[PDB]
Amino acid sequence: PDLAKILEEVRYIANRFRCQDESEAVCSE
């Protein structure tokens, strides 16, 4: 149901945060 559609959104934001953290790690190197 629509709960499954909620999970996709939360996936998007979480993966956005992961990608920006990875970029920050590269920058720290």
Q: Which residues bind a copy of itself (CB under 8 A)?
A: 1-7, 9-14, 16-18, 21
Q: What does the alpha-carbon distance between residue 18 and residue 28 come to, in Å, rounded to a whole number?
A: 15
- Rounded to the nearest whole angstrom, what is the least distance from the CB of residue 18 to a copy of itself in the complex? 8
Q: What does the alpha-carbon distance between residue 4 and residue 7 come to, in Å, rounded to a whole number?
A: 5
* Nearest residue (CB) to a copy of itself, 10 versus 29: 10
What CA dihedral angle connects 11, 24, 22 and 16, to 10 degrees?
A: 20
- Rounded to the nearest whole angstrom, what is the least distance from the CB of residue 7 to a copy of itself in the complex? 5
- Rounded to the nearest whole angstrom, what is the least distance from the CB of residue 25 to a copy of itself in the complex? 13
